[PDB]
Amino acid sequence: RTLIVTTILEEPYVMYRKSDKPLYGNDRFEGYCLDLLKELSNILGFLYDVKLVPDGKYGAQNDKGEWNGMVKELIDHRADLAVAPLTITYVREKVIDFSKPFMTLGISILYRKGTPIDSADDLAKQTKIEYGAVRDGSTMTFFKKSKISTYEKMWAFMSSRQQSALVKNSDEGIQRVLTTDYALLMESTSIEYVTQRNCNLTQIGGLIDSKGYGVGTPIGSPYRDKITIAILQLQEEGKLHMMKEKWWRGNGCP
Amino acid sequence: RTLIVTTILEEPYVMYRKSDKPLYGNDRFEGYCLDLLKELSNILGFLYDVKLVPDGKYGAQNDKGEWNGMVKELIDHRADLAVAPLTITYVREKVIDFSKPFMTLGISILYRKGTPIDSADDLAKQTKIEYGAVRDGSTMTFFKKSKISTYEKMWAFMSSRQQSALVKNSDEGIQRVLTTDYALLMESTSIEYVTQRNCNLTQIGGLIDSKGYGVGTPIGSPYRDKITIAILQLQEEGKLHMMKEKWWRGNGCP
Ligand SMILES: C=C(C)[C@H]1CN[C@H](C(=O)O)[C@H]1CC(=O)O
Ligand SMILES: C=C(C)[C@H]1CN[C@H](C(=O)O)[C@H]1CC(=O)O
Ligand SMILES: [Cl-]
Ligand SMILES: [Cl-]
Ligand SMILES: [Cl-]
Ligand SMILES: [Cl-]
Ligand SMILES: [Rb+]
Ligand SMILES: [Rb+]
Ligand SMILES: [Rb+]
Ligand SMILES: [Rb+]
Ligand SMILES: [Rb+]
Ligand SMILES: [Rb+]
């Protein structure tokens, strides 16, 4: 009846609220994922306790196949749900359950406006403009695993020189795009958020692939199917679209 | 044991193959969904028999609350899987299990080229151009249930005059668009297929909602999650993308 929820700070999904005094408990947070959790809890009738994931990671596997991050929290039954922009992937689905997606997206490219670059193949065929992705995220894993020649070429480039083209987190990637001649391979929903707020950046090309974010649960959880039904309800009533517009829309671009 | 797969003829998902002699068994069929089934068969290691759904319906509930179509075939355990452009909806997910989506799409508008109509609100604020949907499909249901004012208005129009603006199937809708002053509310992936083949037709506006097609299984089926993992594998390898290109590409229209 009180669910323990693992999450991670990531704009505009989960952010610290602004207050004149110190904040405690669920009141520390706002964002799209908090709104989602409120809606799910209303539909399904549960209380919840939001806990930042202690290692600050989403969930990836090492060499020994051991997991970290929110994925490992679910595997170890230290949380009932993970509510975050947690990409639904083949490797994660083998070890946890996800609801159906509450948002659909794809990898694309964040770069500057008004350049000759139109596609990933435009990046793949040159070496002057650097490009990469968040290290150990689902986008990086996409490239590492791809057998498409263009994407193999890109992976060879990203992984060269001790992964100097990769970044630790999205904000580092964004600053690298704004300052240097660098393109970031980034989930398209994050790109939309960014380009609403940085009028000199743009998405280049379309989506390279198609995937979703889902609510994570331990394998076998009874909540996964209940949360899926609740998500479908919210989408069909237009609520998920309204929640996206609320958190994404910026102050406009000239 | 060989799995029974329920499906329905719908271009370019499931179509009768062309041959000079009578065809039998799985050899009767080709199309995107047959390709998908072959790939799922090869990942998961099952044999399968494809069976057309006897009532030729996808799955809707009547006034008594009784289901029909492929949804009912699963409910009654007369099929193990349904592989078709079967829309993942709140009402259906209550009664069957769907894999995660193999295709994402949304409702949009099919109409003639060259007109000043640009959106669903352009339709809704007028009476001269007729518009509708396939009766008892998930698109009609979206309009029937919507509490958004524009879609409420459009539903009043569609349901008027004993639903004369509605059509029994997509081909009837397409011919009505081609011949009369009529717009069809249709799933975007089917709009994409139709406009690559009839050059006088176009999509009007973008996608009014977001949803997916998934493989249906009876509640409780062990195949549901195994099929989800296989779909994620196929997506991440670029196979689903290649299969869509194979079946959608038209070579005749500007
Ligand atoms: C914000 C980041 C590190 C997360 C968000 N979804 C992806 C994941 O769930 O792995 C990561 C982004 C990416 O890999 O581009
Ligand atoms: C071809 C039709 C009758 C199917 C395809 N998906 C929807 C379904 O699964 O309900 C229907 C289309 C629609 O309602 O626009
Ligand atoms: Cl915390
Ligand atoms: Cl699922
Ligand atoms: Cl033949
Ligand atoms: Cl048959
Ligand atoms: Rb403060
Ligand atoms: Rb799973
Ligand atoms: Rb290759
Ligand atoms: Rb700059
Ligand atoms: Rb279900
Ligand atoms: Rb138009």
Short mmCIF file of C-alpha atoms in Angstrom, two decimals, chain B residues 1 5 9 17 37 41 43 69 92 95 97 105 115 138 145 170 173 182 197 209 214 228 233 238-239:
data_model
loop_
_atom_site.label_atom_id
_atom_site.label_comp_id
_atom_site.label_asym_id
_atom_site.label_seq_id
_atom_site.Cartn_x
_atom_site.Cartn_y
_atom_site.Cartn_z
CA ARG B 1 3.04 -28.10 -29.94
CA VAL B 5 -1.92 -17.77 -34.93
CA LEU B 9 -6.40 -9.92 -44.25
CA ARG B 17 0.10 -14.44 -52.23
CA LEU B 37 5.98 -14.19 -37.45
CA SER B 41 9.39 -18.25 -34.91
CA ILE B 43 14.07 -16.49 -32.28
CA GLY B 69 -12.82 -10.99 -33.58
CA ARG B 92 -8.45 -4.66 -25.05
CA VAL B 95 -9.07 -8.75 -21.50
CA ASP B 97 -2.15 -9.63 -22.99
CA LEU B 105 1.48 5.15 -34.94
CA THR B 115 -7.08 21.72 -50.46
CA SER B 138 -10.18 1.75 -32.28
CA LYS B 145 -14.94 8.27 -25.77
CA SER B 170 -10.67 0.88 -44.93
CA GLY B 173 -13.22 4.66 -46.73
CA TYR B 182 -14.91 13.05 -47.75
CA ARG B 197 0.04 4.27 -53.98
CA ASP B 209 -2.84 10.51 -30.47
CA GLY B 214 1.32 -5.45 -30.47
CA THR B 228 8.24 -8.79 -26.15
CA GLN B 233 15.77 -7.69 -30.37
CA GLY B 238 17.08 -2.62 -37.39
CA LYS B 239 15.01 -5.56 -38.67
#
